[PDB]
Amino acid sequence: MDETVAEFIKRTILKIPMNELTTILKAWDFLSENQLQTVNFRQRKESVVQHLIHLCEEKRASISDAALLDIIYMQFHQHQKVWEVFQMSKGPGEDVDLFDMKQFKNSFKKILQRALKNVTVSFRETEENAVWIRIAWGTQYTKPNQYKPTYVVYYSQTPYAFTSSSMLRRNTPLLGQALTIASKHHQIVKMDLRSRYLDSLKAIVFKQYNQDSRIIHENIVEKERVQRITQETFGDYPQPQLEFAQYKLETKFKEPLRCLIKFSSPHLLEALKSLAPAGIADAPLSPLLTCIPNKRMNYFKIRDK
Amino acid sequence: TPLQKRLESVRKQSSFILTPPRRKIPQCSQLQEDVDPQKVAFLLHKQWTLYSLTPLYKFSYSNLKEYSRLLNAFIVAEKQKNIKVIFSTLLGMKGTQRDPEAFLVQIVSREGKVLWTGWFCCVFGDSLLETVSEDFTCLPLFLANGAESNTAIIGTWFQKTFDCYFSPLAINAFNLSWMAAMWTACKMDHYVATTEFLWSVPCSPQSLDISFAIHPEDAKALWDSVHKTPGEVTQEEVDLFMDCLYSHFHRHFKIHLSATRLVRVSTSVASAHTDGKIKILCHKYLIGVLAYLTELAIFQIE
Amino acid sequence: RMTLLLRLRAQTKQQLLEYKSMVDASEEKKQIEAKIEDLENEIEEVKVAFEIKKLA
Amino acid sequence: KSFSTLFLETVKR
Amino acid sequence: GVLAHLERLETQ
Amino acid sequence: AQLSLLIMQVKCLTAELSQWQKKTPETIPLTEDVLITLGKEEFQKLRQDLEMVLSTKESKNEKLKEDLEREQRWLDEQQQIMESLNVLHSELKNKVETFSESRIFNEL
Amino acid sequence: VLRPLDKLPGLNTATILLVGTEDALLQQLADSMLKEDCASELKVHLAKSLPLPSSVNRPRIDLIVFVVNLHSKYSLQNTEESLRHVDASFFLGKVCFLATGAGRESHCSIHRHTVVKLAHTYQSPLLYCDLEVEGFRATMAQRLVRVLQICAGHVPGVSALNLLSLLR
Amino acid sequence: EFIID
Amino acid sequence: IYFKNSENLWKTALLAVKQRNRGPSVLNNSLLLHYINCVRDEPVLLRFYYWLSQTLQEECIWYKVNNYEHGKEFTNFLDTIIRAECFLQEGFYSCEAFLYKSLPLWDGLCCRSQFLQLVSWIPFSSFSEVKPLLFDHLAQLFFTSTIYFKCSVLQSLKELLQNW
DNA sequence: TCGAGAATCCCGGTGCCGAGGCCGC
DNA sequence: GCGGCCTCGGCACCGGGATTCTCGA
Description:
The structure is cut from a larger assembly and holds nine protein chains of eight kinds.
Chain A: H1 6-13, H2 21-27, H3 33-38, H4 45-57, H5 63-75, E1 83-89, H6 101-115, E2 120-122, E3 130-137, E4 145-155, E5 160-164, H7 172-182, E6 187-195, H8 198-206, E7 216-217, H9 220-229, E8 245-247, E9 250-251, E10 257-258, E11 261-263, H10 268-273, H11 287-290
Antiparallel strand pairs in A: 1-5, 1-6, 2-3, 3-4, 8-11, 9-10
Helix pairs in contact in A: 1-4, 1-5, 6-7
Chain F: H1 2-20, H2 36-92, H3 101-107
Chain G: E1 15-19, H1 24-35, E2 45-46, E3 61-66, H2 74-80, E4 95-99, H3 112-121, E5 126-128, H4 134-137, H5 141-151, H6 160-164
The structure holds a DNA duplex.
C-alpha cells in the first residue's frame, strides 16, 4: 500500500510459485487464518497477486514486512542468487556473551544507517538459530533499492555469515564491516566460498555434511583400487557444491601459464566422485579437487610449489 | 558434370583419403570492397547459431524486395497461427570473386530492433560452386541468432519457396579443437578475450563442465612451443597443442581432459560452440572463420 | 555328447591348423602396391587349396 | 586326457 | 519383401 | 607397422597354403557311429530350414505377384505417357514451331 | 605383451578381450555379447590398457577388440599406447577396432578417418557401432561373437588368418 | 606442499 | 474447418440423391513421379538430390534420439524411396550417397529390409569405385551377421545385379 | 608525480522458449 | 486420468559497476 512497496509485494508474489503460496503467505503473518479463505489461492496467478495485494491495501503493508515477505520467499528459494561466505574472527578473549537478537538488530541497523542512511534492513530470526538479514541498499542520494537486495544469512553466534553476492558494490566492505561490528567480532574475511546452494554452504563451512562369471574383468585389481581411493577422499553423501569451483592457475607448463579453470556441474562433488571410476580421472584425484569441502573452499587461487 | 561431378565428389569425401587438412593460419582478412562497416561491425559480436543450408533453387540477387514481402507476409501469418523483413546483400562476405554474395534476413520490429538477423554466406566454398548448376545460388552457411522459433519459421519459408534445407550445423569436438588451434595461431594484437575451452565430461549421472580458460597471450606462447612448420598448421600440431592442454590439466587435476569432449572454444578470434549456437565473431577475421565454417558446412551438405 | 566331441574334433582340426600355420610362419626367416598382390594370389590360391579341400 | 570337459564335467564338483 | 520378411524371421 | 604386418601376412598365407596342401581329406577316422546320429540330425536341420525357406519363397512370389501387378500398372502408366508424349511431340512439331514474330504481333 | 597362442585353447571357449578406457560401456557390450545363448563358451575379458597386469592362468585369448570411444581422444591415446603391447602375430586376424560413439558425429573428438587410418595401418577389421544404445549393441554383440568363432576356430572352415582376408 | 605435482 | 458440411440433415434426401443418381518433394505423388522419371534434367535431379540427402540425414539423426518410434516413419519413408526407385528405376543419387555415408556406421538389422533394398538401386559406378566404398562394408557386415542378414545381402546383391 | 573520465574484464539481472501440470471427450 | 490448454525455469544474450590507467588540480 505504498510506492516501491505495493508493487514490490506484487513483484515478489508473482515470484513465488503456485504450490507454495500458502506456505510463504502463512509465515509472514499479515494474512491471518481468516484472510486465507477470502482469496481463492487455486484460481489464477494474476487473480491472487491482485487480491492478496488488496488484502495488504486493507492491511496497509509497509516495506518493513514487505521485505520480510522477500526473506520468506528466499528461505525456500535459497538455491538461487549465489552466496558468498563471510568468516568473522575475534582475537584473543572470551566469546560474544551478548548476542541479543534485539541488540544485534540494533547494532546492525545503527551501523548500516550510519553510512548507508537509506536502507531497509529486515531481519528474520529463523528456527535453525540463524538470523536471516535482508538488506535493500541505497546511498543517501537515492531511495533504498528493493529491486536487488543483499540477503545476509548470519548464523547467530557463528563466525561465518553467508551473503547473497548480488552486485559486490562499495557496500560489500560495509556489509562485512557492519556484520563484524554488530556481532562482537573484529575482522570480517570473505571465505571465498561462493555457491548457489546455501544448504550446502552451511554444510561445508560448519563441517556438518558427514556427521557375471563369464565377464572376467582383467583390471579388477585396478578397479578395486580406484574405487577404494574414491571412498577415502569422498566418504559418503557429498554435498552439492554446484558452483563454478574456479582454479585460477598460475603455474609454469611442465614464466607461468595463467589458467582460469571453472568446474561447472549441477552437482559437483558427486560429479567428481563418479569421475575416476568412469575412467575420466586417475585414482588419486588431485586433492585440489578432493579437498573442496575439506578446505572449505572452491574459488581457488593456486600457485606453484 | 552437372550431377555426376557431385557423385564423384561424394565418392572422394566418403573415401576418407588421408584427411589431415594442413590449414593456413587464418590470414588477416583486410575487409574486401564495400563490406558495410556498420553492418559488418554489427554482425561481428553476435552469437550466430550455425546451420547447413543446401543450395537455393531459383534464387536471384535482384528480387530481394519480392522475397522480403513474401517472407514478411509469412512470418506475421505464423503469428496468426509489427515485423519487417529486410533482405540485404552484404557485398563482400565471399572468399573468391565467383562465390555467391552473402545476404542477410533481418526480422526488424517500430524501431530497428533486429529480432532475428539471419545470414547466409558462402566464402571459400568453391567445393560446392563447381559441383552445382547455375540455377542454384548455393550458400552453405546459415546464421540464426534470433529465437529458435523464428529460425524454425524462416527455415520453413525457405524450404517452401527455394527448396533449401537447414540442417543445424554441429561442429564436432575434432573440428572445434582445430579451430581452437588456428585461432591462437593468428597474428593478432590486443587480445579481446581469454582462450577458453569449455569441456564437458561424459559422466552418465552428472554433467560436470570444465572451462579451461587460458590467458590468450599465454596460449599463444604455448602454441609456439608446438608450432614448427609456419604458414600451415598440421593435424599433429593441433593435436600437440591440445595435448599440451591435456598435460597441463591432467597434471593439475589428475582428470584426463582428453577423455572429455570440447563443447565451446572461446578465443580472441571467434568463440565456437558445438550444439549450434557457435560462432561469435569477436575480431574481423570473419572471412577466415567463415571460410572454415563454410568448409565444414560443405562436409554436412556433401 | 558325440555331437559335442564332433564340434571338438572340428575345432581342434582347425586350432592345430592355425598352430601349424603359425609355427611354419615362425620357421621362415616390399612393393606395397604388389605386397597386397602377393597377398591376394594366395587368398585366391589357398582358397582353391581349401575350397577343393572342403569339397573333398 | 583333455582336462577340458571330459574331465571337468565328469569331475563336476 | 523377402527383406521385410527376413527381418521378421530374425525376430521370429 | 603396415609393412611389418604385410610381410608377416604373406609369410602366414604361405604357411597356411603349404599346410592346406598338406591336408589330405581325412575321411579315414571319419566317425565310428553308423552316422544315424549325424544323419537324422542333418535331415532334421533340413526340416528346420525347409519350413524356413518355404516361408521365404512363399513371400517371394507373394511380393513378386504384388510387384507384377504394381509394375504392370507402372508399365501401363508408362505406355500411356509414352504414346501421349509421342503424340505431343508430333503435334507440337510444325504446329507451334510455325510461329512468326510479326504474326505474334498481329495476334496481339 | 599379449600373444595369440601363448595359452592352450579349451573346448568351446572363445575368450574375447574388450579394450576401452571407459568401462561401463565395455561392461554393457560384454553383457549384450553374453545375452544371446550361443553355442560357444564365451569367457569375455575386459581391460583398459594392453600391459594387462601379468596374471598367469589367463586363457588363450582369441580376440582383442579395441573399443575406441570416438567421443574421447583418450580412447585413442590409450589404444595407440596399448597398440604397442600387442604381438605382431596377434594383429593378423584376432584384432578388431570397435568405434563406439560413431554416428552421433557431434561428440566426436576424433575424426572417423583417424580411427580408419589406425585400423588400416594395423591391418585389422574396424567395426563401427554406437555401444551406448542396446539396439546397436545387441547386433554388434552378435557381430563380435561371430568374429569370435572365426578367430577362435569354432567355425571349422575359417581361421583368424582367413578372417582379415575377408574384411580388407 | 601445495601438491602441484 | 475442412469441408465439414452441415447438409447432413439434407443428406437424408441428399444421400437418397446419391442413391437416386446411382440407380436412375515429389515422392508422395505417383502422378508426378512420372515427370521426374522422364526428365533426367540437371536442376530437378539436383532439386531432388538435396532434399533426399537432408531427409535421410536429419530423419536418420532422428534415430539417435528415439531409435524406436522414429524407426517406423523412417522405415515407411525409406519404403516410399524404395518404391519411387523401383518405379523410376534408377538409383537416386542421394540413395547411394546416403548409403556410402551410413553403411560403415550401419548395424545388421537397423532398417535392414530398407537399406538392403537401397543397395539394389545404386548407379553402376565401376565396381572399382563402389567396391571399397560400399561392398567392403557389405562384406564387413556380411561375414559377422547371422544367416538372416546373410540371405538378405545376396538377395540384396541379387536385385542389385538385375538393376545393373 | 595525481584526480576525474572512459572502457572494458568479471558476472549478473534480464529475456524467452521446452518441460511439467492441468482441465473435456 | 487424458486433449489442448497453460505456466516456471535452465540457458543465454545484452546492460551498468568498479578496476585500469590514462590525464588534469
